[PDB]
Amino acid sequence: WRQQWSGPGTTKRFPETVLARCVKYTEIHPEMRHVDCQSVWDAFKGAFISKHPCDITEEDYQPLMKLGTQTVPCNKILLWSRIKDLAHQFTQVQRDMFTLEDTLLGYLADDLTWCGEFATSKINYQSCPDWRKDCSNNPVSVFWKTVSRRFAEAACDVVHVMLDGSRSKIFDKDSTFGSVEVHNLQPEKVQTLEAWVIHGGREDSRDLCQDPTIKELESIISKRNIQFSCKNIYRPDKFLQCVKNPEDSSCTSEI
Ligand SMILES: *[C@H]1O[C@H](COP(=O)(O)OP(=O)(O)OC[C@H]2O[C@@H](n3cnc4c(N)ncnc43)[C@H](O)[C@@H]2O)[C@@H](O)[C@@H]1Cl
Ligand SMILES: [K+]
Numbered sequence: 001w002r003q004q005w006s007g008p009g010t011t012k013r014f015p016e017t018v019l020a021r022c023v024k025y026t027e028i029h030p031e032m033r034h035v036d037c038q039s040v041w042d043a044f045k046g047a048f049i050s051k052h053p054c055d056i057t058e059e060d061y062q063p064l065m066k067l068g069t070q071t072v073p074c075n076k077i078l079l080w081s082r083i084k085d086l087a088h089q090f091t092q093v094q095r096d097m098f099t100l101e102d103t104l105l106g107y108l109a110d111d112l113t114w115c116g117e118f119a120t121s122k123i124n125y126q127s128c129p130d131w132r133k134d135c136s137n138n139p140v141s142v143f144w145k146t147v148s149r150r151f152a153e154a155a156c157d158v159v160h161v162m163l164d165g166s167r168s169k170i171f172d173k174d175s176t177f178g179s180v181e182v183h184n185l186q187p188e189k190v191q192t193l194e195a196w197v198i199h200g201g202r203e204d205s206r207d208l209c210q211d212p213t214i215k216e217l218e219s220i221i222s223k224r225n226i227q228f229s230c231k232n233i234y235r236p237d238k239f240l241q242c243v244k245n246p247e248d249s250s251c252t253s254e255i
Contacts, residue, residue, distance in 0.1 A: 005053075006133035009125040010114045018044055018108050025107045032070060032104050043067050044108070045123075047139065053115035053128060054135035056142040065146060068105040072098050074156035074189065081177030083164040083198055086236055090162070093244045097160075105147045115139045145180050152184035158192045159185060163214075165232070166200025171213040173220070182217070187225040193217075194229040196255065198236050208232055231255050 011017060022037035043063040048056060076097045080087035087099045100106035115128035115138065129138040161177070163170050172178055185193060195217065197208040208214065209230035218228040231254060233239050242251035 005115070005124075005127035005129045007128045007130035007138075008113055009127050010123045011112045012125065014112060014114050014123065015041065015045070017112065021108050022104070025104050029104070035067065035104065040064065040067050040104075040108070047143070048114060049116045049123070050118065050121050051116055051139075052118040053124070053139050054137055055118075056137050056139050058142060058146045061143055061146045064105070065150065068103075068108075070103050070105070072103060072151070072154060074154055075158065077151070077155040077159050079152070079155075079159060079161040079177065079181055081161065081163055081171065081175050081181075082167060083162045086198055086240075087162045089240055090243065093240055100148055100151050103147075103151065106151075109140075109143055109147075113140055144176065148176065149180050149184050152181040153186060155185060156189040156191075158194055159190055160194050160196060162196050162198060164200070165197040165203055165208045165211075169213045170197060170208060170211050171195075171217040173213075173216055178217075178220075182220055183224075185221075185224060185226055190226050192227040192229055193221050194231065196231055196233050198233045205234055 019037055019041045022035065022040050026032045026035050026037065043066075047060040047064055051060065073096070078087055078091060078097050078099050080099060084099070084101070088101060091097050091099050091102050101110045113128050115124045116122065117124055128140070129135045131138060131141045161181075169175075195209075195214065197211075197214065199205075199208070209232060214230055218230070221228040233255065238250055238252075239255065242248055245251075
């Protein structure tokens with residue numbers, strides 16, 4: 001009966017895009033220069049080619065995880081939930097801190113779609129499974145759960161997280177951040193999780209650190225024996241300007 005999936009198909013020129021991103025990343029990051037980008041592509045394709053794209057497992061991605069092993073300075077991590085573009089803008093100006101997309105494997109996959117099919121060795125450019133409409137264990141969703149659990153496990157000292165203060169659930173306990181990332185923060189390594197709650201422009205300077213879902217996050221973090229801190233980012237434009245030039249007279253010292 002199944003004639004196609006509900007989601008968009010594999011990114012056009014996905015193979016070229018993965019290989020090119022690997023070459024660019026290993027140029028910019030001489031600490032990953034040991035990587036063989038063709039081997040990385042072959043491991044990536046091997047995770048999902050010739051497999052039914054609702055049957056993918058974390059073990060499928062183990063060859064890729066091995067080749068893309070990277071040590072990230074554990075006290076320099078910025079996590080995010082539903083506000084990736086501002087998190088990226090932040091690490092473009094605070095260049096010693098890392099989101100997952102600043103790691104080799106996150107950089108390879110960012111904003112892409114991919115899948116295969118059981119019958120053949122071909123990449124499916126026509127359609128790929130949507131996580132909700134078709135199946136959760138799809139090539140893209142399984143990749144991100146695999147790599148983000150390792151990223152969260154590795155974080156230490158003070159960990160920061162950006163949250164979207166415009167959403168109905170500023171912290172959604174069932175989001176990928178709330179499931180995979182929060183519950184892989186290890187208390188033996190992590191002292192504090194500090195949330196940066198980004199105002200949208202319709203929160204009227206309310207203190208969103210008192211929001212019910214932030215109180216939920218505080219309780220979950222407290223139960224993992226980690227300290228919780230929360231800061232409102234009232235003006236995300238001015239915040240980035242001040243990260244770039246900390247002496248600009250528009251700067252606050254709220255963060
Ligand atoms: C750990 O959690 C972060 C994302 O958490 P979230 O709360 O924003 O997730 P969600 O909205 O519940 O699910 C989003 C879904 O998107 C996939 N995904 C993650 N990162 C990317 C990038 N960079 N590009 C495209 N798709 C992405 C993933 O399957 C999520 O489940 C996040 O930093 C890691 Cl996953
Ligand atoms: K701790």
